[PDB]
């Protein structure tokens, strides 16, 4: 009965991770937007036809 | 918890995929409005900034 | 974001599954009904002594 009652803190610290990952995948949404509009800042700053204002 | 009536956590991601359709929504409604993809800085500030010297 | 997990983390902690205690109850209640009458019937163990007197 005692091991049965003790897996009430082993649920809790599985949530507890579930939760943790939640918030890193929330921030990792906001990182590949970041990184995908960075992306197109470099490719068009590769191109020599840009003046130096632009670039 | 699984069977609660005090924290709905199905509701909460629900509305925040209703939040993220009405934000589209309102994209969409700015380019129908002013006929512009980049109307400001706030959507492309240097590509704006190029344009308005243009 | 944050905020939402943050309650919903709350929620993990602290809320009942309450699927779970509609079981609890009716065992209690009929466990509650047996006690009273297993103490009636220890109630009764003197009045056998009557009989011999």
């Known amino acids: 009965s005692a091991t049965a009652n003790s897996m009430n803190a ?14 890193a995948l929330a921030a990792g949404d906001t990182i590949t937007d970041l990184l995908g509009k960075m992306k ?3 490719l068009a700053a590769s191109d020599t036809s840009l003046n130096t204002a632009s670039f | 918890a699984l069977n609660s009536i ?24 700015q380019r129908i409005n002013t006929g512009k ?3 400001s800085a706030k ?12 | 974001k944050l905020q939402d997990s943050l309650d919903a983390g ?17 065992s209690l209640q009929t466990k509650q009904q047996l006690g009273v009458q297993a103490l009636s ?9 009557l009989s011999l007197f």
């Open chain 2, 6 to 29: 005090n924290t709905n956590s199905g509701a909460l991601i629900a509305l925040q995929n209703l939040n993220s359709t009405n934000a589209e929504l309102t994209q969409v409604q």
């Open chain 3, 41 to 49: 019937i220890a109630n009764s163990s003197s009045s056998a002594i």
């Open chain 1, 40 to 42: 197109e800042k470099a």
């Open chain 2, 37 to 39: 993809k980049i109307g």
């Open chain 1, 10 to 23: 082993v649920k809790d610290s599985l949530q507890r991770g579930q939760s943790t990952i939640d918030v």
């Open chain 3, 10 to 26: 709350v929620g993990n902690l602290v809320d009942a599954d309450l699927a779970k205690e509609s079981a609890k109850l009716q």
């Open chain 2, 43 to 54: 959507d492309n500030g240097a590509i704006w900034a190029t344009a308005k010297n243009q």
